[PDB]
Coordinates of C-alpha atoms and ligand atoms in Angstrom, one line a residue:
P1 CA 0.0 0.0 0.0
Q2 CA 2.8 2.5 0.9
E3 CA 4.9 0.3 -1.0
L4 CA 2.7 1.2 -4.0
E5 CA 3.0 4.7 -3.1
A6 CA 6.7 4.5 -3.7
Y7 CA 6.0 3.5 -7.0
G8 CA 4.1 6.6 -7.4
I9 CA 0.6 5.0 -7.2
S10 CA -1.6 6.5 -4.4
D11 CA -4.9 5.9 -2.5
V12 CA -4.9 2.1 -3.4
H13 CA -7.7 0.5 -1.3
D14 CA -8.0 -2.8 -2.8
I15 CA -4.9 -4.8 -3.6
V16 CA -5.0 -8.3 -5.1
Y17 CA -1.5 -9.9 -4.5
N18 CA -0.8 -12.9 -6.4
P19 CA -4.3 -13.9 -7.5
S20 CA -5.1 -17.3 -7.8
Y21 CA -6.4 -19.1 -11.0
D22 CA -9.8 -19.4 -9.4
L23 CA -10.1 -15.7 -8.5
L24 CA -9.0 -14.8 -11.8
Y25 CA -11.6 -16.8 -13.5
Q26 CA -14.4 -15.4 -11.3
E27 CA -13.2 -11.8 -11.9
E28 CA -13.3 -12.5 -15.6
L29 CA -17.0 -13.8 -15.5
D30 CA -18.4 -11.2 -13.1
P31 CA -21.6 -10.3 -15.0
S32 CA -21.1 -6.7 -13.9
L33 CA -17.8 -5.8 -16.0
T34 CA -18.2 -3.6 -18.8
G35 CA -16.0 -3.3 -22.2
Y36 CA -12.8 -4.9 -22.9
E37 CA -12.5 -6.3 -19.3
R38 CA -15.4 -8.8 -19.8
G39 CA -14.6 -12.4 -20.0
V40 CA -17.0 -15.1 -21.7
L41 CA -17.1 -18.6 -20.8
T42 CA -16.6 -21.2 -23.8
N43 CA -17.6 -24.9 -24.0
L44 CA -14.0 -26.0 -23.7
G45 CA -13.9 -24.5 -20.2
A46 CA -11.3 -21.5 -21.1
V47 CA -12.5 -17.8 -20.8
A48 CA -12.2 -15.8 -23.8
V49 CA -11.8 -12.0 -23.8
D50 CA -11.3 -9.1 -26.4
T51 CA -7.9 -7.2 -26.2
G52 CA -9.7 -4.2 -27.7
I53 CA -8.6 -2.0 -30.6
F54 CA -5.2 -3.5 -30.1
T55 CA -5.0 -7.2 -31.4
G56 CA -1.3 -7.3 -31.9
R57 CA 1.7 -5.2 -31.0
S58 CA 2.4 -1.6 -31.9
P59 CA 6.0 -1.4 -32.7
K60 CA 5.4 2.3 -33.7
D61 CA 4.5 3.1 -30.2
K62 CA 7.7 1.6 -28.6
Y63 CA 10.1 4.2 -27.0
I64 CA 13.3 3.2 -24.9
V65 CA 14.8 6.1 -22.6
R66 CA 17.9 7.2 -24.1
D67 CA 20.1 8.3 -21.0
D68 CA 23.7 7.6 -20.0
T69 CA 22.9 4.2 -19.4
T70 CA 21.6 3.0 -22.5
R71 CA 23.2 5.8 -25.0
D72 CA 26.2 3.7 -26.2
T73 CA 24.7 0.3 -25.8
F74 CA 21.3 0.2 -27.5
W75 CA 20.5 -0.4 -30.9
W76 CA 18.9 2.8 -31.5
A77 CA 16.2 3.5 -34.6
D78 CA 18.0 6.9 -35.2
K79 CA 21.7 5.8 -35.3
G80 CA 21.9 4.6 -38.7
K81 CA 22.6 1.3 -38.0
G82 CA 19.9 -0.4 -40.0
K83 CA 16.1 0.0 -39.2
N84 CA 14.6 -1.0 -35.8
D85 CA 11.8 0.3 -33.3
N86 CA 14.1 1.2 -30.6
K87 CA 13.0 4.8 -30.8
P88 CA 14.7 7.3 -28.3
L89 CA 12.8 8.8 -25.3
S90 CA 14.0 11.6 -23.2
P91 CA 14.0 11.3 -19.3
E92 CA 11.4 14.4 -19.2
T93 CA 8.8 12.9 -21.4
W94 CA 9.2 9.4 -19.5
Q95 CA 8.5 11.3 -16.5
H96 CA 5.2 12.6 -18.0
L97 CA 4.3 9.0 -19.3
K98 CA 5.0 7.8 -15.7
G99 CA 2.5 10.4 -14.2
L100 CA -0.3 9.1 -16.7
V101 CA 0.1 5.3 -15.7
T102 CA 0.6 5.9 -12.0
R103 CA -2.3 8.3 -11.7
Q104 CA -4.5 6.0 -13.7
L105 CA -3.6 3.1 -11.7
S106 CA -4.2 5.3 -8.3
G107 CA -7.7 4.7 -6.5
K108 CA -8.3 1.7 -8.4
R109 CA -8.4 -2.0 -7.1
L110 CA -5.1 -3.2 -8.4
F111 CA -3.8 -6.7 -9.1
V112 CA -0.1 -7.5 -8.5
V113 CA 1.6 -10.2 -9.9
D114 CA 5.2 -11.4 -9.1
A115 CA 7.0 -13.6 -11.7
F116 CA 10.1 -14.5 -13.2
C117 CA 11.5 -14.1 -16.6
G118 CA 14.1 -16.7 -17.1
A119 CA 14.5 -20.2 -15.8
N120 CA 17.7 -19.8 -14.1
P121 CA 17.9 -18.0 -10.7
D122 CA 21.4 -16.4 -11.8
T123 CA 20.1 -14.6 -15.0
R124 CA 16.4 -14.2 -14.4
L125 CA 14.5 -11.1 -13.8
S126 CA 12.2 -10.6 -10.8
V127 CA 9.0 -8.8 -12.4
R128 CA 6.5 -7.1 -10.5
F129 CA 3.4 -6.5 -12.9
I130 CA 0.8 -4.0 -11.9
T131 CA -2.6 -4.0 -13.7
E132 CA -6.1 -2.9 -13.1
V133 CA -7.5 -5.6 -15.7
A134 CA -8.0 -9.3 -14.3
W135 CA -7.3 -11.0 -17.8
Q136 CA -4.1 -9.0 -17.9
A137 CA -2.9 -10.3 -14.5
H138 CA -4.2 -13.8 -16.1
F139 CA -2.1 -13.4 -19.2
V140 CA 1.2 -12.6 -16.9
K141 CA 0.4 -15.5 -14.6
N142 CA 0.1 -17.7 -17.6
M143 CA 3.0 -16.5 -19.6
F144 CA 5.8 -15.7 -17.0
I145 CA 7.4 -18.3 -14.3
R146 CA 5.0 -18.4 -11.4
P147 CA 7.3 -18.3 -8.2
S148 CA 7.1 -20.9 -5.4
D149 CA 5.6 -19.6 -2.1
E150 CA 9.3 -19.5 -0.9
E151 CA 10.5 -17.4 -3.6
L152 CA 7.4 -15.1 -3.1
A153 CA 8.5 -14.8 0.5
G154 CA 12.1 -13.2 -0.3
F155 CA 10.6 -11.8 -3.5
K156 CA 12.8 -8.5 -4.7
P157 CA 11.6 -6.8 -7.9
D158 CA 14.3 -6.3 -10.6
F159 CA 11.7 -4.8 -12.9
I160 CA 8.5 -3.2 -12.8
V161 CA 5.6 -3.4 -15.4
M162 CA 3.0 -0.9 -14.8
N163 CA 0.0 -1.4 -17.4
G164 CA -2.2 1.7 -17.7
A165 CA -4.0 0.4 -20.7
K166 CA -6.9 2.6 -20.0
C167 CA -5.1 5.9 -20.0
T168 CA -3.9 7.8 -23.3
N169 CA -1.1 10.6 -23.7
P170 CA -2.8 13.9 -24.7
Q171 CA 0.7 15.6 -24.9
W172 CA 2.1 13.0 -27.5
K173 CA 2.2 15.6 -30.8
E174 CA 4.0 18.0 -28.5
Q175 CA 6.3 15.2 -27.3
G176 CA 7.2 14.0 -30.8
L177 CA 5.7 10.6 -30.4
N178 CA 3.7 8.5 -33.0
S179 CA 0.1 8.4 -31.2
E180 CA -1.5 8.7 -27.9
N181 CA -0.6 5.3 -27.0
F182 CA 2.9 4.1 -25.5
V183 CA 5.1 1.2 -24.8
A184 CA 7.8 2.8 -23.1
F185 CA 11.0 1.3 -21.3
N186 CA 13.5 2.8 -18.7
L187 CA 16.7 0.9 -18.0
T188 CA 17.7 3.4 -15.5
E189 CA 14.4 3.0 -13.2
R190 CA 14.0 -0.6 -14.7
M191 CA 10.5 -0.2 -15.7
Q192 CA 7.9 -0.8 -18.5
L193 CA 5.0 1.7 -19.0
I194 CA 2.0 0.5 -21.2
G195 CA -0.5 3.3 -21.9
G196 CA -3.4 3.1 -24.4
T197 CA -3.2 -0.4 -25.7
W198 CA -4.6 -3.5 -23.6
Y199 CA -2.8 -5.8 -25.6
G200 CA -0.7 -8.4 -23.2
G201 CA 1.7 -9.4 -25.8
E202 CA 3.3 -5.9 -25.0
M203 CA 4.4 -7.2 -21.5
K204 CA 5.7 -10.6 -23.0
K205 CA 7.6 -9.2 -25.6
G206 CA 8.5 -6.1 -23.4
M207 CA 10.6 -8.2 -21.1
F208 CA 11.6 -10.5 -23.9
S209 CA 13.4 -7.2 -25.2
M210 CA 14.8 -6.5 -21.8
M211 CA 16.2 -10.0 -21.8
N212 CA 17.6 -9.3 -25.2
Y213 CA 19.5 -6.5 -24.0
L214 CA 20.7 -7.7 -20.7
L215 CA 21.7 -11.4 -21.6
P216 CA 24.2 -10.8 -24.6
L217 CA 26.2 -8.2 -22.6
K218 CA 27.1 -11.3 -20.3
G219 CA 27.9 -13.7 -23.1
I220 CA 24.6 -15.4 -23.0
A221 CA 22.6 -15.9 -26.3
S222 CA 18.8 -14.5 -26.2
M223 CA 16.7 -16.1 -28.9
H224 CA 13.3 -15.7 -30.7
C225 CA 12.8 -19.5 -30.7
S226 CA 11.1 -22.6 -29.7
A227 CA 12.7 -25.5 -28.1
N228 CA 12.3 -29.1 -27.1
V229 CA 14.6 -32.2 -26.3
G230 CA 14.2 -35.9 -27.4
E231 CA 14.5 -38.9 -25.0
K232 CA 17.8 -39.1 -26.2
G233 CA 18.8 -35.8 -24.5
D234 CA 19.0 -34.1 -28.1
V235 CA 18.1 -30.4 -28.1
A236 CA 16.6 -28.5 -30.8
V237 CA 15.9 -24.8 -31.3
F238 CA 13.5 -23.5 -33.8
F239 CA 13.9 -20.1 -34.8
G240 CA 11.5 -18.0 -37.1
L241 CA 9.4 -14.8 -37.2
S242 CA 5.6 -14.6 -36.1
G243 CA 3.4 -17.5 -37.8
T244 CA 6.2 -19.4 -39.1
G245 CA 5.6 -22.5 -36.9
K246 CA 7.8 -22.2 -33.6
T247 CA 4.7 -22.9 -31.4
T248 CA 3.1 -25.3 -33.7
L249 CA 6.2 -27.6 -34.7
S250 CA 7.7 -27.7 -31.3
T251 CA 4.7 -29.1 -29.7
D252 CA 5.5 -32.7 -30.8
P253 CA 4.3 -35.5 -28.6
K254 CA 7.4 -37.5 -29.0
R255 CA 9.8 -34.8 -27.6
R256 CA 9.5 -32.7 -24.3
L257 CA 8.8 -29.1 -24.9
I258 CA 11.2 -26.7 -23.2
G259 CA 9.4 -23.5 -24.6
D260 CA 7.7 -22.1 -27.6
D261 CA 9.2 -18.7 -27.9
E262 CA 12.0 -17.2 -25.8
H263 CA 15.1 -18.9 -24.8
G264 CA 18.5 -18.1 -23.7
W265 CA 21.7 -20.2 -24.4
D266 CA 24.4 -19.9 -21.4
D267 CA 27.5 -22.2 -20.3
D268 CA 25.0 -25.0 -19.4
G269 CA 22.5 -24.9 -22.2
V270 CA 19.1 -23.5 -23.4
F271 CA 16.5 -22.4 -20.9
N272 CA 13.2 -20.9 -21.2
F273 CA 12.3 -17.3 -20.3
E274 CA 8.5 -18.2 -19.9
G275 CA 6.1 -20.2 -18.0
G276 CA 3.4 -20.4 -20.6
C277 CA 2.6 -20.7 -24.4
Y278 CA 1.0 -18.3 -26.5
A279 CA -0.6 -20.2 -29.5
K280 CA -2.2 -19.1 -32.6
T281 CA -5.8 -20.3 -32.9
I282 CA -6.7 -18.9 -36.4
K283 CA -8.4 -22.0 -38.2
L284 CA -6.9 -24.2 -35.4
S285 CA -7.6 -27.9 -36.3
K286 CA -7.9 -30.4 -33.5
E287 CA -6.7 -33.1 -35.6
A288 CA -3.6 -31.1 -36.8
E289 CA -2.7 -29.8 -33.3
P290 CA -4.2 -31.9 -30.7
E291 CA -1.9 -31.0 -27.9
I292 CA -2.5 -27.3 -28.4
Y293 CA -6.0 -27.9 -28.9
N294 CA -6.3 -30.0 -25.5
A295 CA -4.5 -27.0 -23.5
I296 CA -7.6 -24.9 -24.2
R297 CA -9.5 -25.6 -21.0
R298 CA -10.1 -23.6 -17.5
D299 CA -7.2 -21.5 -16.8
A300 CA -6.0 -20.9 -20.6
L301 CA -7.0 -17.5 -21.7
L302 CA -8.5 -17.1 -25.3
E303 CA -8.2 -13.9 -27.1
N304 CA -10.3 -12.2 -29.9
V305 CA -11.8 -15.4 -31.0
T306 CA -15.5 -15.2 -32.0
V307 CA -17.6 -17.4 -29.6
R308 CA -21.1 -18.3 -30.7
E309 CA -24.1 -17.5 -28.5
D310 CA -24.1 -21.2 -27.4
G311 CA -20.4 -21.1 -25.9
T312 CA -19.0 -22.7 -28.8
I313 CA -16.0 -21.1 -30.6
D314 CA -15.6 -20.3 -34.3
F315 CA -11.9 -20.7 -34.6
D316 CA -12.1 -20.1 -38.3
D317 CA -13.4 -16.7 -37.9
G318 CA -10.7 -13.9 -38.4
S319 CA -12.9 -10.9 -38.7
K320 CA -11.7 -9.2 -35.2
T321 CA -8.1 -10.3 -36.2
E322 CA -6.3 -12.9 -37.8
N323 CA -4.0 -12.8 -34.8
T324 CA -6.4 -15.0 -32.5
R325 CA -4.4 -16.5 -29.5
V326 CA -4.6 -18.6 -26.5
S327 CA -2.1 -18.3 -23.5
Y328 CA -1.9 -21.2 -20.9
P329 CA 0.5 -22.2 -18.5
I330 CA 3.0 -24.5 -19.9
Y331 CA 1.9 -27.4 -18.0
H332 CA -1.3 -27.5 -20.0
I333 CA 1.0 -29.5 -22.4
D334 CA 1.4 -33.2 -21.1
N335 CA 5.0 -33.7 -22.4
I336 CA 7.4 -30.9 -21.0
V337 CA 10.7 -30.6 -19.2
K338 CA 9.9 -30.1 -15.6
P339 CA 10.2 -28.7 -12.9
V340 CA 12.5 -26.4 -14.6
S341 CA 12.2 -25.4 -18.5
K342 CA 15.8 -25.9 -19.5
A343 CA 17.9 -28.6 -21.2
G344 CA 21.4 -29.1 -22.7
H345 CA 23.2 -27.4 -25.5
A346 CA 21.1 -27.4 -28.9
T347 CA 22.6 -29.7 -31.2
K348 CA 20.0 -28.9 -34.0
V349 CA 19.1 -25.3 -35.0
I350 CA 16.2 -24.7 -37.2
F351 CA 15.4 -21.5 -39.1
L352 CA 11.7 -21.6 -40.0
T353 CA 10.5 -19.3 -42.7
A354 CA 7.0 -19.1 -44.5
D355 CA 8.2 -17.9 -47.9
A356 CA 4.9 -16.6 -49.9
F357 CA 7.3 -16.1 -53.0
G358 CA 7.1 -20.0 -53.3
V359 CA 11.0 -20.3 -53.9
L360 CA 12.6 -21.7 -51.0
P361 CA 12.6 -25.4 -50.6
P362 CA 11.0 -27.4 -47.7
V363 CA 14.4 -28.0 -46.1
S364 CA 17.9 -27.5 -46.5
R365 CA 21.0 -28.3 -44.4
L366 CA 22.9 -24.9 -44.1
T367 CA 26.7 -24.3 -44.0
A368 CA 28.2 -22.1 -41.3
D369 CA 28.2 -19.1 -43.6
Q370 CA 24.6 -19.6 -44.9
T371 CA 23.8 -20.0 -41.6
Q372 CA 25.0 -16.5 -40.4
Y373 CA 23.9 -15.1 -43.7
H374 CA 20.4 -16.4 -43.1
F375 CA 20.3 -15.5 -39.5
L376 CA 21.1 -11.9 -40.4
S377 CA 18.7 -11.6 -43.0
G378 CA 15.6 -13.0 -41.0
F379 CA 13.6 -13.6 -44.1
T380 CA 9.8 -14.5 -44.1
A381 CA 7.0 -13.2 -46.5
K382 CA 3.2 -12.7 -46.6
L383 CA 0.3 -12.9 -49.3
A384 CA -0.8 -9.3 -48.2
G385 CA -3.0 -9.2 -51.2
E386 CA 0.9 -10.2 -53.4
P387 CA 4.0 -11.6 -52.0
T388 CA 5.3 -9.2 -49.4
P389 CA 8.7 -9.7 -47.9
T390 CA 9.9 -9.0 -44.3
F391 CA 13.6 -9.1 -43.4
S392 CA 13.8 -9.1 -39.7
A393 CA 17.3 -9.5 -38.4
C394 CA 17.8 -12.7 -36.0
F395 CA 14.3 -13.7 -37.0
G396 CA 12.9 -11.1 -34.4
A397 CA 14.4 -7.6 -35.0
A398 CA 11.1 -6.2 -33.3
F399 CA 12.8 -7.6 -29.9
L400 CA 16.2 -6.8 -30.4
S401 CA 17.9 -4.4 -28.0
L402 CA 21.4 -4.8 -29.2
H403 CA 22.8 -4.8 -32.8
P404 CA 21.9 -7.7 -34.7
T405 CA 25.5 -8.6 -35.2
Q406 CA 26.0 -9.0 -31.4
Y407 CA 23.0 -11.7 -31.3
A408 CA 24.9 -13.7 -34.4
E409 CA 28.1 -13.5 -32.6
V410 CA 26.8 -15.2 -29.5
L411 CA 24.8 -17.8 -31.4
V412 CA 27.8 -19.0 -33.3
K413 CA 29.8 -19.3 -30.5
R414 CA 27.1 -21.4 -28.5
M415 CA 26.8 -23.3 -31.7
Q416 CA 30.4 -23.9 -32.6
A417 CA 31.1 -25.1 -28.9
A418 CA 28.3 -27.8 -29.0
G419 CA 28.9 -28.7 -32.7
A420 CA 25.6 -27.6 -33.7
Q421 CA 24.0 -27.9 -37.1
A422 CA 21.6 -25.5 -38.9
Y423 CA 19.0 -26.3 -41.3
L424 CA 16.4 -23.8 -43.2
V425 CA 12.7 -24.9 -43.3
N426 CA 10.1 -23.3 -45.6
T427 CA 7.0 -23.9 -43.7
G428 CA 5.4 -21.6 -46.1
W429 CA 4.4 -21.7 -50.0
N430 CA 5.1 -23.9 -53.1
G431 CA 4.5 -23.2 -56.7
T432 CA 1.0 -24.8 -55.9
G433 CA 0.1 -21.2 -54.4
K434 CA -0.8 -23.3 -51.3
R435 CA 1.1 -23.8 -47.9
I436 CA 2.8 -27.1 -47.5
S437 CA 1.0 -29.4 -45.1
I438 CA 1.5 -29.2 -41.3
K439 CA 2.0 -33.2 -41.7
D440 CA 4.9 -33.1 -44.3
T441 CA 6.4 -30.4 -42.3
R442 CA 6.4 -32.5 -39.1
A443 CA 7.9 -35.3 -41.0
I444 CA 10.5 -32.8 -42.4
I445 CA 11.3 -31.8 -38.8
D446 CA 11.6 -35.7 -37.6
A447 CA 14.0 -36.4 -40.5
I448 CA 16.2 -33.3 -39.3
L449 CA 16.1 -34.4 -35.7
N450 CA 16.6 -38.4 -36.2
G451 CA 19.6 -38.1 -38.5
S452 CA 17.8 -39.0 -41.8
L453 CA 18.6 -35.7 -43.4
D454 CA 22.2 -35.5 -42.5
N455 CA 22.6 -39.1 -44.0
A456 CA 20.4 -38.2 -47.1
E457 CA 22.1 -37.7 -50.7
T458 CA 21.8 -34.1 -51.5
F459 CA 22.3 -31.8 -54.5
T460 CA 22.7 -28.0 -54.8
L461 CA 19.7 -25.8 -55.8
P462 CA 20.8 -23.1 -57.8
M463 CA 20.9 -19.3 -57.0
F464 CA 20.2 -20.0 -53.3
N465 CA 23.1 -22.8 -53.2
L466 CA 21.2 -24.7 -51.0
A467 CA 21.9 -28.6 -50.1
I468 CA 18.5 -30.5 -50.5
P469 CA 17.6 -34.1 -50.4
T470 CA 16.6 -36.1 -53.2
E471 CA 14.3 -38.1 -50.8
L472 CA 13.4 -38.2 -47.0
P473 CA 11.7 -40.8 -44.7
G474 CA 8.0 -40.0 -44.5
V475 CA 8.1 -36.8 -46.6
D476 CA 6.3 -36.9 -50.4
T477 CA 9.5 -36.6 -52.8
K478 CA 7.9 -34.2 -55.1
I479 CA 7.8 -31.2 -52.9
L480 CA 11.6 -31.6 -51.8
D481 CA 12.8 -29.7 -54.9
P482 CA 10.7 -26.5 -54.9
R483 CA 10.8 -26.6 -58.8
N484 CA 8.5 -29.7 -59.1
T485 CA 5.6 -27.5 -57.8
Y486 CA 5.8 -25.2 -61.1
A487 CA 5.0 -25.9 -64.6
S488 CA 8.7 -25.9 -65.6
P489 CA 11.8 -24.9 -63.4
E490 CA 11.9 -21.8 -65.6
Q491 CA 8.8 -20.5 -63.7
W492 CA 10.5 -21.0 -60.4
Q493 CA 13.6 -19.4 -61.7
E494 CA 11.7 -16.2 -62.6
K495 CA 10.5 -16.1 -58.8
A496 CA 14.0 -17.3 -57.5
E497 CA 15.6 -14.2 -59.3
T498 CA 13.1 -11.5 -57.8
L499 CA 13.6 -13.1 -54.3
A500 CA 17.4 -13.1 -54.7
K501 CA 17.5 -9.6 -55.3
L502 CA 15.6 -8.8 -52.3
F503 CA 17.9 -10.7 -50.1
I504 CA 21.0 -9.3 -51.9
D505 CA 19.7 -5.5 -51.5
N506 CA 18.7 -6.4 -47.8
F507 CA 22.1 -7.7 -47.0
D508 CA 23.9 -4.9 -48.3
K509 CA 23.7 -3.1 -44.8
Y510 CA 26.0 -6.0 -43.4
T511 CA 28.5 -5.6 -45.9
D512 CA 30.7 -2.6 -44.1
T513 CA 32.5 -4.9 -42.1
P514 CA 35.1 -7.8 -43.0
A515 CA 33.3 -11.2 -42.2
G516 CA 29.9 -9.3 -43.6
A517 CA 31.6 -8.8 -47.0
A518 CA 32.8 -12.4 -47.0
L519 CA 29.1 -13.7 -46.1
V520 CA 27.7 -12.1 -49.3
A521 CA 29.3 -15.2 -51.4
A522 CA 27.0 -17.2 -48.8
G523 CA 23.9 -15.5 -50.1
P524 CA 21.9 -16.0 -53.5
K525 CA 23.8 -15.2 -56.4
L526 CA 22.3 -14.0 -59.4
Ligands
ATP1 N1 3.4 -26.3 -42.7 C1 3.1 -25.6 -41.6 N2 4.0 -25.6 -40.4 C2 3.8 -24.8 -39.3 N3 2.8 -24.2 -39.2 C3 1.6 -24.2 -40.3 C4 1.9 -24.8 -41.5 N4 0.9 -24.6 -42.4 C5 0.0 -23.8 -41.5 N5 0.5 -23.5 -40.4 C6 -0.2 -22.5 -39.4 O1 0.7 -21.4 -39.3 C7 0.7 -21.0 -38.0 C8 2.0 -21.3 -37.4 O2 2.0 -20.3 -36.3 P1 3.0 -20.4 -34.9 O3 1.9 -20.2 -33.8 O4 3.4 -21.7 -34.8 O5 3.8 -19.2 -35.1 P2 5.1 -18.9 -34.3 O6 6.4 -19.0 -35.1 O7 5.1 -19.5 -33.1 O8 4.6 -17.1 -34.0 P3 4.9 -16.2 -32.9 O9 6.4 -15.7 -33.0 O10 4.1 -15.0 -33.3 O11 4.5 -16.7 -31.5 C9 -0.4 -21.7 -37.2 O12 -1.7 -21.0 -37.3 C10 -0.3 -23.2 -37.9 O13 -1.7 -23.8 -37.7
OAA2 O1 6.3 -9.9 -39.4 C1 6.3 -10.9 -38.7 O2 6.1 -12.0 -39.8 C2 6.9 -11.4 -37.5 C3 8.0 -10.6 -36.6 O3 8.3 -9.2 -37.4 C4 8.5 -10.8 -35.4 O4 8.2 -11.9 -34.6 O5 9.3 -10.0 -34.9
MG3 MG1 4.6 -18.9 -31.1
MN4 MN1 7.2 -14.7 -30.8

């Protein structure tokens, strides 16, 4: 109460510290709630909420305070080091933003959730989340690591996230900002402020960004990846941009899940930052993804899905957003690493990409130089219509706090010391104009992990110069060479050429060093 006053929040009468799952359930279904707070119970037993006007992140409202602690370390949007959302903020306008949130939260009933980001005591942040919306508390209780009672008794916050979603910033034009909304970070005060947007992904990726800053400065890879481990103890990580399959393909009933999204890699191996999973539900198939489907039950939190009058869910319905989601605590998945989400060094490193140009092969085993080249490129594409490219460095530039080369350097080191091999997987499109199936992709992931691919006869795909197999166990052979899916290889070539020029032009910004100039030869060549 006076502790809250120390944060700048006053006159808090009702404090819900560490809300249980049962309390959050009854908070969400309270029939007196109005607007975006309200939950509805679905027939699957999980509560569904609407996240409001924001249904995904708002990279354009993301600001980071430029002060002496961050000036010379951060990857800044305005210092010509290649395109990012780390936009500088003055300490003075930070203070204004902190007044808006702390006043909004004042005189309110507050939920206070204490949690960890990071599986290891040794590098984890102790985050205190403060919100006035029950489902937001529920989201952080799902997605972050839920402390022991003994960890709670000694809990000392290292980072404070104040979610003032209901407030907006009237002074933003004056202050040179993008909108009345804001997702701001202060590394001196160790705080994230959220204004205007209700969207929970802002806390999740917010703390991920903080880990991405802090970890590699002490030699630890910080990664936008899925991870799981085989009974054999073989660890795989799966990088990729949003919608490329990290969550979908790491939930494999044969392997134990470490996590679906955020992992670090230190002297002992790969560890999960999070305590939950955040699945996409657009067009969700019980048959194609039974583990994810069966995770949706009481304590899962559905977002933005359409719920029929009878409690049932139309999963195909994308009219509120295509980015429909469910969060659930990680133990809603039956086969997971426990009690601690971590395992050994990764020996298999998969770059997932959804290639809407329909050029790239379902799988190739990468050379050590292609591996960097592709890591820094960070390619995926969308049918926005109209194949639209995204090159996002390290398969997640949006969350990067340091220069992309700083993530590449540490990954390579970790990879080199474990003898790890890298693999590029197109989970996207063919010349069929259709996405390759979940089923063929799962069988390609098996072939990568069980050693079948490494021992396969391969040839070089031209232009991109990628080693691809002539056949694989459990995979339709026709799809393996991406040229087969067009009328003639010349129709694939036309597309390959357009795509290569995109990669070429994108990579240029890395060619200002030796090393980087040398990687161009690992790139697609016209
Ligand atoms: N061949 C395929 N491989 C993987 N996923 C596929 C495939 N075909 C269709 N999909 C669909 O694509 C989506 C993959 O999204 P997923 O949640 O796995 O991505 P992600 O990489 O985890 O994204 P984010 O980083 O936003 O969490 C799902 O909707 C899935 O059902
Ligand atoms: O645009 C995408 O495909 C996803 C993306 O930027 C991310 O996860 O950083
Ligand atoms: Mg995911
Ligand atoms: Mn992600």
